């Protein structure tokens, strides 16, 4: 988890809408050849939700606590078509590094769960490189273990982006 | 033209740095006062790597000295090579950590870190093109571990692109000198695994074994151990300073050695180490150096390479020699010891050759291995760590300075994950 | 006029250039300081030929060379050596660290900046040039600079000049020995460059030349100097036709015409026949037939590739010295008689012959013996496909687990480029497999 994260409380929809607008304004955004408003950073929106019941005879207080995590990832880039220079190139390199780590952990998880499920049931040992990047570190419980998780892949229709679209489809199949 | 900024922390780091600066000043013909009295023109060609130039045609090492005990600084100044250093780089305070990692990292070092970083910035801004840093310190102690980790973190925050080396003296298996070595070692390794590019593991017991069995010294002192570590340190960065048939920058070693980011713990070695008594018997050839480098007795980390496999190795030779013989010997070492090298990194032996050998030796070589056997070291520390953390053996000293059990637990978890990552390549037969 | 520009990239390129320019200066009688005593001695003739050297007003001859490297060490060795006054001071050194065996560093983040200066120098050399023949690019796979910067420079040259020939002399990784862990990644990423933009690439292997030195030359502990001298002899034999008179002269264009049946199979093998020590120079005739037969010996190939596993697509012979076409015709006839050498059924012509009168020279301090006759062979054959296959397997063994990948990704490269390059290389391999099938 993250220390000293400014977790605030909202009571009506107007407050959370204001928070949403402020957060979107605060996000780092830069223009590039592939997108006029490309994203330069991964983003996580977290809702901590608590249900309490009040009755001295039957009910339990603080009976339920749950987390909604909504993750917007920055996509892969190619310097030839991207046209980045200087800081943009460094941001693209870091994004690609984090996404490579995410792909590796996805593939390793897939193989690990499939094998012990199908092969026999050995469960000998299978290291998973969660720690190689901060993105996969923060999302450890969502990519596996204690969470119910959904992956929404976006795909470009054009023929020129075929090699990237096929990779996205392959990783969706692995996920 | 490349520079290296040098940082020294703690007693062990200070002494190793002093011996290192004496070995380097010899190689370059700098006199204990800063004046050049060499003979070969190649000595001054690349002297900018370590030494700044002064107005009086003198040379001043680009070194930074850090501690919280003035005694070490006083010992360094009152020495054969004390006046060579500039006095402004002597940064220190009082009331040392006393083998308390928390004091070094959180309480006391937090005040001196600003001054150390100011001197680091002043030295770094004057370089034409800075390459990286290197730090000498001891993990099992106080100010060494804490201030070294804090400085590493701050510099990586400020200089993300540059290289960060580290020559760390880790706790020994059975030899011990402080009661609380596992706590400091575990926390320091937790800090190092995130914020470094290379880390050369050094063990006191391995150096004692080298002194006793190989060099046949009867009464070895710390000077000898510093000598060895200093010969290793020079041997690492030889190609930045002298020409060679096939150079090898620091980045070349970093790229060719580590396969994955979290595995950058290297076992070093040096050859030829004889006995002052059998120098007249052993002929000096490339096969002899290759035989001595890969010998398990010659490692400085006190971890047997035969209990694991070499992910990568790097051999840096210095002296006139033939590339055919070197390549043939590396291939031979791979082929005969086929069981000690991973099967999914074909031809995992980096080679470098430098033309200029050390002062009075015809040939020399240094070895940098990256083997899974290093896991044993961590396991030992982890074992001892549990043996004290379960009962909270000495925990009040650490929690009194502003820490909690969560830091210890997460450091132990990081250590165990590192050990598992090394283990998962250790076995042969990747299928089932 | 007939001349070509030599470009050298990386440590291997610079050292091969040292050997090559030593040989050229010895051939043309130019002293290390650039002066030619024959000009003042004779007062006429043509000795400092325009093919490599340019004559200024004061009689000094300056080479048409362009040295490039990211390190300062290797070229600073040249700038304070025996040939310090020969070269123009423009040596194009990047005052930083090196590509670190990273294609991304040599192609994306650091390979730029100095690329513009390099192209400016090449343009300045070309503007002084009349009737430029082409470029001779020296580099090496397995190095970050020699791969990435070669890619950048070849791309820019193809964009700018285009129709000019661009030959390549590169050192392929050896099957067994190497000096880098990440060599296959660089060698597999350089294939798009070596395929699309180059016109004809000559590949050599360190292991083969080591075996040649051990067997033929009786050198027990050879170093890179001997290898560079051999490669210099090969390049000199290739380019001699532009300089000296001869009965059957072959320039670069007509040389290319008879060695590239199709655009995508321009990967010949190179050999040099009379590699022999001074002691063994006696006891042997070294006639035309002997050297022509020795060119075909599988042990004498300079790449670890057995010709008997494939078919010969084309062959070009370049003879030097006291050679007469009658003996060459006899050698060609008796070779065509032999059944061990297999030629594709769609190339009945087979051989191209070129003859030059100037015999090879002897470098002082060298190892090759002075001989009256010599021959350099270039041969387009399918067996080179095998030499690629052994590499590709290694790449797979490193790419399955994504080892060392993060170093490449952290400098601009994308993960998919590896797979793209691998697919391109597989396409090339299957093309070579297809071209050799017998017609029906
Ligand atoms: C016969 C002869 O010439 O004497 C040798 C000698 O006998 C041996 C034993 C030397 C000797 O070293 C030791 O005895 C020793 C003892 C404890 C710890 C370290 C060394 C020597 O002291 C060490 C010394 O080495 C050097 O001078 C190197 O340049 C070395 N630098 C220093 O030792 C040095 C120390 C203080 C101040 C200035 C220089 C070096 C090596 C690698 C990289 C940089 C520098 C040499 C040749 C010798 C003696 C004098 C006996 C050896 O050391 C080295 C690294 O050369 C030990 O194994 C080698 C092999 C040598 O044959
Ligand atoms: N035959 C021959 N091979 C060489 C020579 N020099 C280097 N090599 C080979 O080239 C390979 C890679 O070296 P280089 O391509 O020169 O590396 P580089 O050009 O300096 O580029 P960087 O890695 O960025 O420094 C090595 O593995 C050597 O085997 C040489 O002089 N002759
Ligand atoms: N190799 C080596 N180790 C040393 C030397 N001096 C002390 N040590 C080691 O350092 C440990 C004690 O740590 P210490 O140096 O006091 O840490 P500090 O107080 O922070 O400087 C012991 O385990 C010793 O083995 C030396 O000169 N050389
Ligand atoms: Mg977006
Ligand atoms: Mg190099």
- In C141-236, which ranges are E strands? 165-172, 200-205
Among candidate residues B25, B62, B58, B85, the one with its CA nearest the CA of residue B234: B25
Residue C90 burial (10 A CB sphere; 0-12, 13-18, 19+): middle
Asked if C329 and C393 count as a contact pair (C-beta separation under 8 A), the reply is no
Two tokens, residue B266: 């290297």
Task: Count Cβ neighbours within 10 Å for each residue of B358-390 and write b for 16 or more, e otherwise.
Answer: beeeebbbbbbbbbbbbbbbbebbbebbeebbe
Q: Which residue is it, tokens 């993250």?
A: A2
Two tokens, residue B309: 């496999």
d(CA A70, CA A49): 14
Asked if B1 and C95 count as a contact pair (C-beta separation under 8 A), the reply is yes
Two tokens, residue A25: 């304004």
Two tokens, residue C237: 């034999």
Asked if B157 and B121 count as a contact pair (C-beta separation under 8 A), the reply is no
DSSP B180-241: THHHHHHHHHHHHTTS-S-EEEEEHHHHHHIIIIIS--SS--HHHHHHHHHHHHHHHTGGGT
CA atoms within 13 A on the CB side of A126: 15
Query: Looking at residue C343, what DSSP letter applies?
Result: B
Among candidate residues B220, B215, B260, B253, the one with its CA nearest the CA of residue B235: B253
Two tokens, residue B321: 């020699």
Among candidate residues B154, B144, B156, B230, the one with its CA nearest the CA of residue B185: B144
d(CA B337, CA B330): 11
Is the bond leading into B354 cis (omega within 30 degrees of zero)? Answer: no
Contact partners for chain B, using 3 or more CB pairs closer than 8 A, are A, C
Nearest CA to ligand 2 atom 9: C12
d(CA C183, CA C147): 10
Among candidate residues B298, B300, B305, the one with its CA nearest the CA of residue B376: B305
d(CA A109, CA A114): 8
CATH superfamily of B260-373: Tubulin/FtsZ, C-terminal domain (3.30.1330.20)
Among candidate residues C209, C181, C112, C100, the one with its CA nearest the CA of residue C151: C112
Domain ranges in chain B?
2-259, 260-373, 374-431
Q: Is A150 helix (H, G, I), strand (E, B) or coil?
A: coil
Asked if A79 and A89 count as a contact pair (C-beta separation under 8 A), the reply is yes
Q: Which residue is it, tokens 């430098």?
A: B354
Query: Looking at residue B339, what DSSP letter applies?
Result: G
Residue B38 burial (10 A CB sphere; 0-12, 13-18, 19+): middle
C299 touches chain B (CB under 8 A): no
d(CA C191, CA C421): 7
Resolution of the coordinates, Å:
3.2
Count, residues in chain A? 175
Phi, psi of B54 (to 5 degrees): -95, 170
- A1: closest chain B residue by CA: B410
CA-to-CA separations, A71 to A65, A142, B235, C210, C235, in angstroms, rounded: 20, 10, 48, 57, 59
Q: Which domains does chain C have, with CATH numbers?
A: 1-268 (3.40.50.1440), 269-383 (3.30.1330.20), 384-440 (1.10.287.600)
Pairs of residues, one from chain A and one from chain C, whose beta carbons lie less than 8 Å apart: 40
CA-to-CA separations, B148 to A33, B154, B164, B231, in angstroms, rounded: 43, 10, 12, 22
Nearest CA to ligand 3 atom 6: B12
Two tokens, residue B278: 């059998």
CA-to-CA separations, B13 to A104, C305, C389, in angstroms, rounded: 39, 53, 50
Angle of CA points C85, C88, C91, to nearest 5°: 110
Active site residues of C: 254
Strand A43-51 to A64-72 pairing: antiparallel
Separation of first and last alpha carbons in chain B: 51
Torsion sign over Cα C251, C252, C257, C260:
positive
Among candidate residues A135, A46, A56, A67, the one with its CA nearest the CA of residue A95: A135
Point out residues after which chain C has a gap (C–N over 2.5 Å): none
Nearest CA to ligand 2 atom 19: C10
| Ligand whose nearest atom lies closest to the CA of C18 | 2
Give residues with Cβ within 8 angstroms of C401, minimum separation 6. Answer: B344
Count, residues in chain C? 440
Among candidate residues C360, C265, C351, C278, the one with its CA nearest the CA of residue C314: C351
CB atoms within 10 A of CB A160: 9
Asked if B203 and B172 count as a contact pair (C-beta separation under 8 A), the reply is yes
Q: Is B411 helix (H, G, I), strand (E, B) or coil?
A: helix
d(CA C169, CA C203): 6
Q: Which H or E run contains B51?
A: strand B51-53
Among candidate residues B238, B234, B259, B261, the one with its CA nearest the CA of residue B248: B238
Do residue A127 and residue B414 have CB atoms under 8 angstroms apart?
A: no
B10 in ligand 3 pocket by Cβ < 6 Å?
yes
DSSP C286-312: --HHHHHHHHT-GGG-SSS--GGGS-E
Partner residue opposite A131 with nearest CB, options B417, B423, B424: B417
Asked if C251 and C241 count as a contact pair (C-beta separation under 8 A), the reply is yes
PDB experimental method: cryo-EM
Beta bridge mates, C378: C270, C316
Among candidate residues B305, B418, B421, the one with its CA nearest the CA of residue B371: B305
CA C285–ligand 4 middle distance (angstroms) = 76
Mutate to test the interface with A, among C113, C152, C405, C412 (most CBs of A within 10 A): C412
For residue A98, say whether it is annotated as part of any ligand binding site.
no
Give residues with Cβ within 8 angstroms of C78, minimum separation 6. Answer: C14, C18, C67, C84, C87, C91
Beta bridge mates, C140: C171
User: How far is C-alpha B131 from the geometric centre of its chain's CA atoms?
Assistant: 17
Torsion of CA B370, B375, B380, B382, to 10 degrees: 120
User: How far is C-alpha B90 from the geometric centre of its chain's CA atoms?
Assistant: 22
The overall longest dimension of chain A from CA atoms, in Å, is: 68
Q: Can you state the angle between helices B70-77 and B10-27, rounded to 10 degrees? A: 20
HEC secondary structure over C209-223? HHHHHHHCCCCCCCC
d(CA B238, CA B244): 9
Beta bridge mates, A49: A66
Do residue A103 and residue C416 have CB atoms under 8 angstroms apart?
A: no
d(CA C178, CA C362): 30
CB atoms within 10 A of CB B237: 22
**What is the Rg, in whole angstroms, of the alpha carbon atoms belonging to chain C?**
21
d(CA A82, CA A93): 12
Strand C351-356 to C312-321 pairing: parallel
d(CA B204, CA B211): 11
Q: Is C68 helix (H, G, I), strand (E, B) or coil?
A: strand
Torsion sign over Cα A153, A154, A158, A161:
negative
Separation of first and last alpha carbons in chain A: 24
Phi, psi of A66 (to 5 degrees): -150, 165
Q: Which residue is it, tokens 């020296």?
A: C138
Q: Which residues of B touch C11 (CB under 8 A)?
A: 246-247
Among candidate residues B176, B155, B197, B184, the one with its CA nearest the CA of residue B7: B155
Question: Which residues, chain by chain, have CB under 5 Å from ion ligand 4?
Answer: A 39
Q: Is B107 helix (H, G, I), strand (E, B) or coil?
A: helix
Asked if C33 and C58 count as a contact pair (C-beta separation under 8 A), the reply is no
Among candidate residues C397, C403, C393, C399, the one with its CA nearest the CA of residue C426: C393
**What is the Rg, in whole angstroms, of the alpha carbon atoms belonging to chain B?**
21
CATH superfamily of B2-259: Tubulin/FtsZ, GTPase domain (3.40.50.1440)
Q: Which H or E run contains B260?
A: none
Asked if B161 and A89 count as a contact pair (C-beta separation under 8 A), the reply is no
Residue B82 burial (10 A CB sphere; 0-12, 13-18, 19+): middle
CA B227–ligand 1 middle distance (angstroms) = 9
CA-to-CA separations, A6 to A9, A23, A69, B85, in angstroms, rounded: 10, 12, 16, 48
C210 in ligand 2 pocket by Cβ < 6 Å?
no
Two tokens, residue C407: 């170093």
CA B248–ligand 5 middle distance (angstroms) = 7
Query: Looking at residue C60, what DSSP letter applies?
Result: -
Query: Looking at residue C66, what DSSP letter applies?
Result: E
Q: Which residues of C touch B431 (CB under 8 A)?
A: none
Residue B427 burial (10 A CB sphere; 0-12, 13-18, 19+): exposed
d(CA B220, CA B211): 7
CA atoms within 13 A on the CB side of A17: 3
Query: Looking at residue B426, what DSSP letter applies?
Result: H
Give residues with Cβ within 8 angstroms of C127, minimum separation 6. Answer: none
d(CA B412, CA B418): 10
Torsion of CA A87, A101, B256, C76, to 10 degrees: -10
Among candidate residues B79, B7, B1, the one with its CA nearest the CA of residue B46: B1
Among candidate residues C223, C149, C143, C231, the one with its CA nearest the CA of residue C181: C143
Q: Which residues of B touch C146 (CB under 8 A)?
A: none
User: How far is C-alpha B121 from the geometric centre of its chain's CA atoms?
Assistant: 23
d(CA A142, CA A154): 20
Task: Count Cβ neighbours within 10 Å for each residue of C130-163 and write b for 16 or more, e otherwise.
Answer: eebbbbbbbbbbbbbbbbbbbbbbbbbbbeebee
Torsion sign over Cα B84, B86, B87, B90:
negative
HEC secondary structure over B365-397? EEEEEEECCHHHHHHHHHHHHHHHHCCCCCHHH
Asked if C194 and C168 count as a contact pair (C-beta separation under 8 A), the reply is yes
CA-to-CA separations, A164 to A104, C24, C275, in angstroms, rounded: 16, 50, 52
* Edge-to-edge strands, sheet with B63-67: B90-92, B63-67, B2-9, B129-138, B163-170, B199-203, B265-271, B364-371, B310-318, B349-354
| Ligand whose nearest atom lies closest to the CA of A154 | 4
CATH number of B374-431: 1.10.287.600
Among the atoms of ligand 1, which is closest to the Cα of residue B26?
38
Q: How far is B370 from chain C (nearest CA, A)?
A: 13
CB atoms within 10 A of CB B36: 15
Among candidate residues C234, C236, C277, C229, the one with its CA nearest the CA of residue C379: C234
Task: Count Cβ neighbours within 10 Å for each residue of B86-118 and write b for 16 or more, e otherwise.
Answer: eeebbbbbeebbebbbbbbbbbbbeebbeebbe
Q: How far is A77 from chain B (nearest CA, A)?
A: 20
CA-to-CA separations, C372 to C1, C319, C321, C361, C375, in angstroms, rounded: 29, 11, 6, 10, 11
Residue C98 burial (10 A CB sphere; 0-12, 13-18, 19+): buried
CA-to-CA separations, B176 to B140, B171, B321, in angstroms, rounded: 9, 7, 42
C414 touches chain A (CB under 8 A): yes
Provide residues with CB under 6 Å of ligand 1.
Answer: B 22-23, 26-27, 215, 224, 227-228, 231, 234-235, 272-274, 276, 279, 358-361, 364
């Amino acid at each position: 988890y993250v220390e000293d994260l400014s977790k605030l409380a909202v009571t009506s929809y107007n407050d959370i809408q204001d928070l949403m607008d402020s957060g979107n304004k605060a996000r780092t955004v830069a223009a590039t050849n592939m997108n006029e408003t490309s994203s330069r950073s991964h983003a996580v929106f977290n809702i901590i939700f608590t249900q309490k019941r009040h009755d001295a005879e039957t009910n339990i207080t603080t009976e339920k606590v749950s987390k909604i995590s909504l993750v917007d990832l920055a996509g892969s880039e190619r310097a030839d078509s991207t046209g980045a220079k200087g800081t943009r190139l460094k941001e693209g390199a870091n994004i690609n590094k984090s996404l490579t780590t995410l792909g590796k952990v996805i593939s390793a998880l897939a193989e690990m769960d499939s094998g012990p499920n199908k092969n026999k049931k050995k469960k000998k040992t299978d290291f998973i490189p969660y720690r190689d990047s901060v993105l996969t570190w923060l999302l450890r419980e969502n990519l596996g273990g204690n969470s119910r998780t959904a992956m929404v892949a976006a795909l470009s229709p054009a023929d020129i982006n075929y090699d990237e679209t096929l990779s996205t489809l392959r990783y969706a199949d692995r996920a | 033209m490349r520079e290296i900024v040098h940082i020294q922390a703690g007693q062990c780091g200070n002494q190793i740095g002093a011996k290192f600066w004496e070995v380097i000043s010899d190689e370059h013909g700098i006199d204990p006062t800063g004046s050049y009295h060499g003979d070969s023109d190649l000595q001054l060609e690349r002297i900018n790597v370590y030494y700044n130039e002064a107005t009086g045609n003198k040379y001043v090492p680009r070194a930074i000295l850090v501690d919280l005990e003035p005694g070490t600084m006083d010992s360094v100044r009152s020495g054969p090579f004390g006046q060579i250093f500039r006095p402004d780089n002597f940064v220190f305070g009082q009331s040392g950590a006393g083998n308390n990692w928390a004091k070094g990292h959180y309480t006391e070092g937090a005040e001196l870190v600003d001054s150390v970083l100011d001197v680091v910035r002043k030295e770094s801004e004057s370089c034409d093109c800075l390459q990286g840093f290197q730090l000498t310190h001891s993990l099992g102690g106080g100010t060494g571990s804490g201030m070294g980790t804090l400085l590493i973190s701050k510099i990586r925050e400020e200089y993300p692109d540059r290289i960060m080396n580290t020559f760390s003296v880790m706790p020994s298996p059975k030899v011990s000198d402080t009661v609380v070595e596992p706590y400091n070692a575990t926390l320091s390794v937790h800090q190092l695994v995130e914020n470094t590019d290379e880390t050369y593991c050094i063990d006191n017991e391995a150096l004692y074994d080298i002194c006793f069995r190989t060099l046949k010294l009867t009464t070895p002192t710390y000077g000898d151990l510093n000598h060895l570590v200093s010969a290793t340190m020079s041997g690492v960065t030889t190609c930045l300073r002298f020409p060679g048939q096939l150079n090898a920058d620091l980045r070349k070693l970093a790229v060719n050695m580590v396969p994955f980011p979290r595995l950058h713990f290297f076992m070093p070695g040096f050859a030829p180490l004889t006995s002052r008594g059998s120098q007249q018997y052993r002929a000096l050839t490339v096969p002899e150096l290759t035989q001595q480098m890969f010998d398990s007795k010659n490692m400085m980390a006190a971890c047997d390479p035969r209990h694991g496999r070499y992910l990568t190795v790097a051999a840096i030779f210095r002296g006139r020699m033939s590339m055919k013989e070197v390549d043939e010997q590396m291939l031979n070492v791979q082929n005969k010891n086929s069981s000690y090298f991973v099967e999914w990194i074909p031809n995992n032996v980096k080679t470098a050759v430098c033309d200029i050998p050390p002062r009075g030796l015809k040939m020399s070589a240094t070895f940098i291995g990256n083997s899974t056997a290093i896991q044993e070291l961590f396991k030992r520390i982890s074992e001892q760590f549990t043996a004290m953390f379960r009962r909270k053996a000495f925990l009040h000293w650490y929690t009194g300075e502003g820490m909690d059990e969560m830091e210890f637990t997460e450091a132990e978890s990081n250590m165990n994950d590192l050990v598992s990552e090394y283990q998962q390549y250790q076995d042969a037969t990747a299928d089932e | 006029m007939r001349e070509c520009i030599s470009i050298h990239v990386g440590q291997a390129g610079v050292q091969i250039g040292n050997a090559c320019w030593e040989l050229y200066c010895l051939e043309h009688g130019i002293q290390p300081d650039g002066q030619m005593p024959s000009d003042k001695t004779i007062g006429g003739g043509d000795d400092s030929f325009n093919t490599f050297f340019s004559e200024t007003g004061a009689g000094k001859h300056v080479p048409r060379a362009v040295f490039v490297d990211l390190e300062p060490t290797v070229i600073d060795e040249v700038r304070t050596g025996t040939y310090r006054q020969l070269f123009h001071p423009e040596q194009l050194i990047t005052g930083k660290e090196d590509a670190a065996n990273n294609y991304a560093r040599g192609h994306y983040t650091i390979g730029k900046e100095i690329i513009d200066l390099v192209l400016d120098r090449i343009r300045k050399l070309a503007d002084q040039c009349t009737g430029l023949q082409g470029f001779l690019v020296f580099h090496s796979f397995g190095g970050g600079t020699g791969s990435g910067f070669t890619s950048l420079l070849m791309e820019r040259l193809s964009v700018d000049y285009g129709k000019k020939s661009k030959l390549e002399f590169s050192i392929y990784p050896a099957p067994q020995v190497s000096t880098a862990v990440v060599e296959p990644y660089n060698s597999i990423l350089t294939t798009h460059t070596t395929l699309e933009h180059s016109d004809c690439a000559f590949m050599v292997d360190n292991e083969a030349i080591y075996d040649i030195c051990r067997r033929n030359l009786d050198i027990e502990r050879p170093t890179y100097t001997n290898l560079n001298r051999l490669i210099s002899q090969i390049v000199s034999s290739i380019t001699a036709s532009l300089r000296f008179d001869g009965a059957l002269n072959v320039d670069l264009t007509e040389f290319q015409t008879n060695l590239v049946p199709y655009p995508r199979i321009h990967f010949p093998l190179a050999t040099y026949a009379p590699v022999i020590s001074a002691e063994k120079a006696y006891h042997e005739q070294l006639s035309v037939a002997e050297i022509t037969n020795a060119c075909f010996e599988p042990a004498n190939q300079m790449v670890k590739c057995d010709p008997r596993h494939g078919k010969y697509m084309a062959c070009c012979l370049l003879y030097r010295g006291d050679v007469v076409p009658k003996d060459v015709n006899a050698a060609i006839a008796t070779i065509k008689t032999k059944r061990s050498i297999q030629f594709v059924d769609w190339c009945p012509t087979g051989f191209k012959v070129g003859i030059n009168y100037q015999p090879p020279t002897v470098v002082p301090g060298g190892d090759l013996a002075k001989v009256q006759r010599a021959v350099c062979m270039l041969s387009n054959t399918t067996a080179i496909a095998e030499a690629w296959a052994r590499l590709d397997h290694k790449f797979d063994l490193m790419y399955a687990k994504r080892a060392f990948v993060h170093w490449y990704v952290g400098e601009g490269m994308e993960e998919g480029e590896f797979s793209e390059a691998r697919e391109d290389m597989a396409a090339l391999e299957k093309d070579y497999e297809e071209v050799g099938v017998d017609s029906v």
